[PDB]
Each structure stands twice: as structure tokens, then as C-alpha cells.
Design a protein around this ligand. Structure first.
Ligand SMILES: CN(c1ccc(C(=O)NO)cc1)S(=O)(=O)c1ccc(-c2ccccn2)s1
Ligand SMILES: [K+]
Ligand SMILES: [K+]
Ligand SMILES: [Zn+2]
Length: 352
């Protein structure tokens, strides 16, 4: 077994480290997890590289081939620069989430972790927001070999548009996303009015949130909507993305969460006791993202972690404080009690 599965292999971590816009985060994340000796308490499973056929269960051959070519418009460039070996990078992530999926389809595993996955923005034929391959989607598509109702819960700061669009017309998968929704804020979509299309209408729930949201309030919103969604929908399996770009101190500077808030949310989903695929995502303050995910790793394990940071390779990276906890800034919570209730009521009606 009941020990969660931890997708890892030095080759995978190093391949993940080569991501241009987020260098070394994989190692840092794994290193801190290892430092608290959190691993060796999970079932370590090596990642399998995704094949062309597998990745194409969503992406088009046109896009896959092209990507494989430059690794030697499709959304490539500035935000998504096709650096050397990027195709390999993508295939390893995708492969990694698909193997976490298989780990769940089979037994002896109620939770499968791939902190390096979670790129929800990738379209079937286009890279977007640092996302080259949509692993979350590939995991969901794998999970559906055995589960008729999958619940996708996206807690990244950004809207999970890629995964949502992928299933907007089906009621097999239900995508729920809590994100910042403001005029010029990427990807600029996902208002509460967004509920899906055709046969998928009401199977896409979006929770537009504003800057400054803190642990408490965030959790009340989350539990409120999740509880409602667990009722109407009878999820057999669950895919959860935990982008840490919501954590106080992120360069993104929008939400004001700490891993503990996001923690209560995790605990809430873990208590349904369903097959759960854990993914990472955003998180541009490399040190905090590591603190966030190793802590959440502890929450998956239940074992409370030592407040002081354990000596390891990146010990220095832990600011001046050197503690596991993260303190929110003194920024205001631009979320009025009335609009949040209004949003909740809208979706609450929608759910049928
Ligand atoms: C590419 N972009 C994304 C998209 C998605 C994410 C994300 O975390 N999604 O969950 C992050 C950045 S973006 O256009 O909004 C950017 C944000 C910050 C960017 C940046 C890039 C270089 C230097 C400084 N800032 S680009
Ligand atoms: K989100
Ligand atoms: K859907
Ligand atoms: Zn994000």
C-alpha cells in the first residue's frame, strides 16, 4: 503493498534537469525527498520512455514527428524553445506518467507519484506554457483502460486548459481546475461559466480565483467544490496536479499559499481512497517547490517532517532561514466573500 509508488531513476531525473526554463528542479526535488529519507518508504519504480504510438493517443503524428526533428506553428520558440534533446525530455515525462498510470491500473499501489510531470497546457498538436507533451492527458487516457470515470483535479496556479480541452466533449473524464483568472493572465481562460461542451457539458468545472488567496480560504473553496463534485460524479480514479507556483515566494507572485494549505486539499482527496496519480507542474522558486513537494510527499506518507532542512547537495539553496516551512508575504487577499460564494453557487447548480 500500500506504499505509494515513486517514479524515479537517475537517468530520468537528469533528463528532467535539462529543462531550459527550470534547470535542476528535478534533482533538487528528489534530493530533498531523499534527504528526509522519504523514499525507501515508497515503492521506487523506474520510468518507461513513451513510444510514438503511446504519445500519439493524444498528440498528432504531425506534431510528434516535428518535435522529434528539432530535438536533433507548433507552439515552439520563446516560451517553448525546442532545445536539443527536447523530444527525449518530453517522451520521458510522458512515459513516466503513463507508467504511474499502469502502476495504478495494476494493484499494490493506491498512489503513484511523478513530481516531474504535470504539463497541463500542451495541446494535441502544439506546445504551450513550457509544456511540450501533455502527460496528464496521457495518464488519464491510460487510466481509462480500467476506469470509466476519472477525476482530474488541477491545483496549479494556471488554468488546466490543455487537459480540459482534451475531454470537453466526454463525460468519462471530469476536469476541475482552481486558478487565477485575470485579463492578461495566462492562459486567459477558464471562467466559472466554462462547463464543457456537448456530451461533456457540466463535466468541466472551473474555479476562477484572485491574487492573495491564503491557505484557509483556499481550502474552504477547494473542499467545497470537491465535496460537491464527489457527490454528483462517482470517480473511480483520480489524477491530481500540484503545481507549486501558488506558493508564497514564487516569481509568479500571485497566490499566497504554503504547502500546508495545498496539503489539506491533498489529504481531502487521499481520504476518498481512490487510485491516485500525483503530478507536479509549475513552481519557479526552485527551493520552495522542493520544500512544497517533499512536504506533500510526507502528507501522502502521513509522517510529519522535521522543520529544519537536512544537509544534502542543495542545502545552501535554502535561503537564509533553512526551515521547511514557508511564510506568506503580507499581501492582501483580493478575494471578496461574496464573489467566491457566487462562483461556488454557479458550479453547485451546474453539477447534475
Ligand atoms: C510561458 N508562460 C507560462 C505558461 C504556463 C506556466 C505554468 O506554470 N503553467 O502551469 C508558466 C509560464 S508565460 O507566457 O505565462 C510566462 C511566464 C513567465 C515568463 C518568463 C519567461 C522568461 C523570463 C521571465 N518570465 S513567460
Ligand atoms: K489549476
Ligand atoms: K469533461
Ligand atoms: Zn502554472
Amino acid at each position: 503493498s500500500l506504499v505509494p509508488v515513486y517514479i524515479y531513476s537517475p537517468e530520468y531525473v537528469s533528463m528532467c534537469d535539462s529543462l531550459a526554463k527550470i534547470p535542476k528542479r528535478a534533482s533538487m526535488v528528489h534530493s530533498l525527498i531523499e534527504a528526509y529519507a522519504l523514499h525507501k518508504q515508497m515503492r521506487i519504480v523506474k520510468p518507461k520512455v513513451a513510444s510514438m504510438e503511446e504519445m500519439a493517443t493524444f498528440h498528432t503524428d504531425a506534431y510528434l514527428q516535428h518535435l522529434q526533428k528539432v530535438s536533433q506553428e507548433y507552439g515552439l520558440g520563446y516560451d517553448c524553445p525546442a532545445t536539443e534533446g527536447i523530444f527525449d525530455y518530453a517522451a520521458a515525462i510522458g512515459g513516466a506518467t503513463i507508467t504511474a498510470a499502469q502502476c495504478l491500473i495494476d494493484g499494490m499501489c493506491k498512489v503513484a507519484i511523478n513530481w516531474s510531470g504535470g504539463w497541463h497546457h500542451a495541446k494535441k498538436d502544439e506546445a504551450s506554457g513550457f509544456c511540450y507533451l501533455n502527460d496528464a492527458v496521457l495518464g488519464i487516457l491510460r487510466l481509462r483502460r480500467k476506469f470509466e470515470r476519472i477525476l482530474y483535479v488541477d491545483l496549479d496556479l494556471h488554468h488546466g486548459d490543455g487537459v480540459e480541452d482534451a475531454f470537453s466533449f466526454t463525460s468519462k473524464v471530469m476536469t476541475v481546475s482552481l486558478h487565477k483568472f485575470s485579463p492578461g493572465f495566462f492562459p486567459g481562460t477558464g471562467d466559472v461559466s466554462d462547463v464543457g461542451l456537448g456530451k461533456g457539458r457540466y463535466y468541466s468545472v472551473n474555479v476562477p480565483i484572485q491574487d492573495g488567496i491564503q491557505d484557509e480560504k483556499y481550502y474552504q473553496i477547494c473542499e467545497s467544490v470537491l465535496k460537491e463534485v464527489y457527490q454528483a460524479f462517482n470517480p473511480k480514479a483520480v489524477v491530481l496536479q500540484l503545481g507549486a507556483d501558488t506558493i508564497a515566494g514564487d516569481p509568479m507572485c500571485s497566490f499566497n499559499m504554503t504547502p500546508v494549505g495545498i496539503g489539506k486539499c491533498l489529504k481531502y482527496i487521499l481520504q476518498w481512497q481512490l487510485a491516485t496519480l500525483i503530478l507536479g507542474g509549475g513552481g519557479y522558486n526552485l527551493a520552495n517547490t522542493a520544500r512544497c513537494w517533499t512536504y506533500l510527499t510526507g502528507v501522502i506518507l502521513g509522517k510529519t517532517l522535521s522543520s529544519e532542512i537536512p544537509d544534502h547537495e542543495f542545502f545552501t539553496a535554502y535561503g537564509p532561514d533553512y526551515v521547511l516551512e514557508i511564510t506568506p508575504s503580507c499581501r492582501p487577499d483580493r478575494n471578496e466573500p461574496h464573489r467566491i460564494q457566487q462562483i461556488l453557487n454557479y458550479i453547485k447548480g451546474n453539477l447534475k
